[PDB]
Amino acid sequence: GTFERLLDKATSQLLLETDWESILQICDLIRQGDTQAKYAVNSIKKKVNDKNPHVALYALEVMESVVKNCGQTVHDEVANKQTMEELKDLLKRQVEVNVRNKILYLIQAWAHAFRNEPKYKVVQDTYQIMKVEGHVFPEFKESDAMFAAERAPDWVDAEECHRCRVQFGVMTRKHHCRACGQIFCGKCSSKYSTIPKFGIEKEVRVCEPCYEQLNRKA
Ligand SMILES: O=P(O)(O)O[C@@H]1[C@H](O)[C@H](OP(=O)(O)O)[C@@H](O)[C@H](O)[C@H]1O
Ligand SMILES: [Zn+2]
Ligand SMILES: [Zn+2]
């Protein structure tokens, strides 16, 4: 029961200050596959709801790290209605400022990190409604919300268009979709889109399948 010992250690009400080494080890356990994301997150959540606010805050610190460091299987456990309702309720009953601030901080950082994913829109909606209702968030640093970004794919070379298979030549020239990296003729890659996921906020050439995925993602 390594995960459980580490989580107890990291959230102890005898712990003076945050135990980063246990937290990094917990993240490694989830990344290596030794602890499954669902179980890990549910376990951390039990600690978040502890009556002692030192334990609760240490638990939120574990939650922050596992979300930042462990990928989509952990994102999917927090970026949902159930967790947003739980955090709103936890916020409502907090008296200690550092705990209230940490919850607000996380809602905001996650809302940014998960923006333009329809599945996770409930996080942005929670941020928006808390802001509307007068909750003052800590100052946002974009650096706290880059953890889900990926880089754009490498480009493929081929002698025909990936979509229509027209053969490239001197007068049928090559283009690429920045979202999938495939190679296209001009007719098949006429769309332009940003690609927030890859850090692209300029409008860049995409194919129609990628344009629609990204269009409906916005
Ligand atoms: O000007 P060309 O000699 O046809 O060169 C092509 C362009 O630079 C294309 O840019 P684009 O995707 O921005 O249109 C690029 O995708 C192709 O791979 C190149 O072969
Ligand atoms: Zn084509
Ligand atoms: Zn594409």
Residue 105's CATH number: 1.25.40.90
Task: Show which of 92, 115, 150 is a domain's final residue.
Answer: 150
> Which atom of ligand 1 is nearest the CA belonging to 189?
12
- Give the residue from 167, 165, 193 showing the smallest Cα distance to 179: 193
Residues 133 and 100 both lie in one domain: yes
Query: Is 16 found in the same domain as 51?
Result: yes
81-93 and 97-113 helices cross at what angle (nearest 10)? 160
Q: Residue 210's domain spans which residues?
A: 151-218
Specify whether 21 is located in the same domain as 39.
yes
Q: Are 157 and 110 part of one and the same domain? A: no
* 31 and 91 share one domain: yes
Q: Is the CB of 102 under 6 A from ligand 1?
A: no
Number of domains in the chain: 2
Q: Are residues 156 and 125 in the same domain?
A: no
Shared domain check, 181 and 82: no
Distance 215 CA to ligand 2 centre (A): 20
Enter the tokens of residue 148: 């889900």
- 164 annotated to a ligand binding site: yes
Q: How far apart are CA 186 and CA 130, in angstroms?
A: 45
Domain boundary among 97, 127, 150: 150
Cα separation, 13 vs 35, in Å, equals: 24
Asked if 100 and 202 sit in the same domain, the reply is no
- Are 7 and 43 in contact, with CB atoms under 8 Å apart? yes
Phi, psi of 192 (to 5 degrees): -135, 135
List the resolution, Å. Answer: 1.7
Measure the CA–CA gap between 193 and 201, rounded to whole angstroms. 8
The secondary structure of residue 156, as a DSSP letter, is: P
Of the ligands numbered here, which is closest to the C-alpha atom of 175?
A: 1
The reply to whether ligand 1 has any atom less than 6 angstroms from the CB of 175 is yes
Among protein residues, the one with the nearest Cα to ligand 1's atom 14 is: 175
Tell me the C-alpha distance between 167 and 161, whole Å.
7
* Contact by Cβ (8 Å): 59, 47: yes
